[PDB]
Design a protein around this ligand. Structure first.
Ligand SMILES: *Cc1c(COP(=O)(O)O)cnc(C)c1O
Ligand SMILES: *Cc1c(COP(=O)(O)O)cnc(C)c1O
Lengths: 385, 385
């Protein structure tokens, strides 16, 4: 029992196998060396471990290891890719197009670039979170140098057609960046086919450790960015600093694991997700945010009408979930939900350790909770005539 | 025996206690929560651990927890403090003063600011590595907004009078940043007294894990910087991104340990360092780069004259050390050493697990190895008339 964790999108637990691998690269009896120490064995062994992990990450997304730049997380990756490309190609233009539902790491980076003189078009998504590709194309100009649209949304799990957006960008000579923190290891990614130029990844959203991530930077056709972190020109000049070996080994192991169990795990999560939805879609006034069909298999975001969101989370004390509110979720607001519905919205994000028992328990707890509140709810009183 | 590790300045092993604390914040059965998840217990517990570590770090350096900003390492801390303060106060001036012997994270950051329109004065150190404060003083102008001089040099261990430098800066209203990555936990630091406004710290140089660090940002008199990492306004708007709890717990425990054992360990290292130098200082043409009495108690950088540096490292294969070459060390070159002598220089850095047994073995190996090299050395032949 205990507080059931259904907030995997916020962060996931490190896989035991990842944890045990990481432990081998920390203490004095392990490979604790600095890979930058080129004159001795401690460094050589550390460097080898990094290369193995860099290849493991690359294998998952069908990339060349040299295209993988290590960062401290997907936030830095997002900052590096957008600020990096925006600054590098600014002579070609200063227009950037993105989406209003992007993660803050993308939105706040674009806001900073706006104060630096760049122009940013924040596209509004359709009611279901999907970006109208026609509007995207209409927004593109001769001075547009970059587009950033995420693969899977962290709040509602909607999936964008990154392959198609990439096509549109390559044809116009526009750099395309994808924040794939919520899709890597869940949805198939093959950059040998995909026309994406920059792609952000993280470790802790796929059972790896927090504080590590990577940025895919296409080698062919060659894409370039200005490093945002200086001090040695590490990572082929794109990101300076000491390589956190144990963190890097953990991310690699996490990505090796994902490649192998992805197919079976995702089909499993999709089943638990539908199970959850089927068990509550019948509740009087409930709305699903996104698309329980093409969206991510592990995310379920639903709004419960005629209930004070302020007390919803308290009602669901037995569940560790999220509402998105910081002010209500800006993603839900971008979808068109009013402040009240947005507040009384819950995101259920499933993971590797979620079971049917938990789901059925959750289904029950939700129906009952929504039932009680609605009884002693002045708002619901209003609904029923 | 095996390759004796005398490269503690490049990186240190994670202390066993640090490693065991970290392991409790990774897997499903431990505190794996995202501290940013404010609606449930997994988040709350993680937040508590972070706050505990933030205090442990602040206590070592005499700061307030609120002045500690978490970063991915000292490289990022250096980037954040300098780019952050430069951009924030640019309307008051764009002149920055630093030292030619600073770590690359400071130098390459200053180089980037230069192409962005900032003016940087790189002061040359004295023969012994000390910055002549009168020269620093003469370089300060009314439009000088920032100074960055490190506490302990990573290559030669020389110590700068940061207290006096801080006084000079505060009196002129200049922001003073100190890269204290090699001094924290080794030399006493009390920010409640020290007139330093920004200070960089790392974890893996003081037996903590790689990939984690912090930036001290003075609260009173209030100092401010522009964030370089966007996405949520975390760390009081100064550094966005997920807080890597297991990493932060580790740095905290590492700083807790350093506060407790600093006095006893530093005296021990000073003894071993002195033991090493005494055993080789009598070798024909050997020179100590830095200062034997005031320099850091764990770093010994020596040059061996009239000997090809190319064979030096190999000859000392039984030791894991560094020559600081990339091209010879730029620090040594800044001290006035010719390219050849700089190349034939070795940096010995000691730590928590170094023993007198290792030092004595090192002494013998150095003497014998240097004698053998000089036996067949064309350079030595020239010298011997
Ligand atoms: C979590 C997340 C990020 C930020 O990840 P980092 O590793 O945590 O800092 C960025 N984008 C998306 C879509 C995310 O879910
Ligand atoms: C190692 C070091 C740095 C960089 O440290 P990070 O944790 O490794 O990236 C900066 N300054 C000094 C003086 C150092 O010794």
């Amino acid at each position: 029992k205990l507080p059931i964790y259904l907030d995997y999108s916020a962060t996931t637990p490190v896989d035991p196998r990842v944890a045990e691998k990481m432990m081998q690269f920390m203490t004095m009896d392990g490979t604790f060396g600095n890979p930058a120490s080129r004159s001795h064995r401690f460094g050589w062994q550390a460097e080898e471990a990094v290369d193995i992990a860099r290849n493991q990450i690359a294998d998952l997304v069908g990339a060349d290891p040299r295209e993988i730049v290590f960062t401290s997380g997907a936030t830095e990756s997002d900052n590096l890719a957008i600020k990096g490309a925006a600054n590098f190609y600014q002579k070609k233009g200063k227009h950037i197009i993105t989406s209003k539902t992007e993660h803050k790491a993308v939105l706040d980076t674009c806001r900073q670039l706006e104060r630096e003189g760049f122009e940013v078009t924040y596209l509004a998504p359709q009611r279901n979170g999907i970006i109208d590709l026609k509007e995207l194309e209409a927004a593109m100009r001769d001075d547009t140098i970059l587009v950033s649209i995420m693969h899977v949304n962290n709040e509602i799990g909607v999936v964008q057609d990154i392959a198609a957006i990439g096509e549109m960008c390559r044809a116009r000579g526009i750099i395309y960046h994808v924040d794939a923190t919520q899709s890597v290891g869940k949805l198939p990614i093959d950059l040998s086919q995909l026309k994406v130029d920059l792609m952000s990844f993280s470790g802790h959203k796929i059972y790896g450790p927090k504080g590590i991530g990577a940025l895919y930077v296409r080698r062919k056709p060659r894409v370039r960015i200005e490093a945002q972190m200086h001090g040695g020109g590490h990572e082929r000049g794109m990101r300076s600093g000491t390589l956190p070996v144990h963190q890097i080994v953990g991310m690699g192991e996490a990505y090796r694991i994902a490649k192998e169990e992805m197919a079976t795990e995702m089909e499993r999560l999709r089943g638990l997700r539908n199970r959850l939805w089927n068990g509550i879609k019948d509740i009087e006034e409930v709305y699903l945010n996104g698309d329980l069909e093409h969206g991510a298999p592990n995310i379920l975001n639903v709004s419960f009408n005629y209930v004070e969101g302020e007390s919803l989370i308290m009602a669901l004390k037995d569940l560790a979930v999220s509402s998105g509110s910081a002010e209500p979720s800006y993603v839900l607001r971008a979808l068109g939900l009013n402040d009240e519905l947005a507040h009384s919205s819950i995101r259920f994000s499933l993971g590797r350790f979620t079971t049917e028992e938990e789901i059925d328990y959750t289904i029950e707890l939700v129906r009952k909770s929504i039932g009680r509140l609605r009884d002693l709810s002045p708002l619901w009183e209003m609904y029923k005539q």
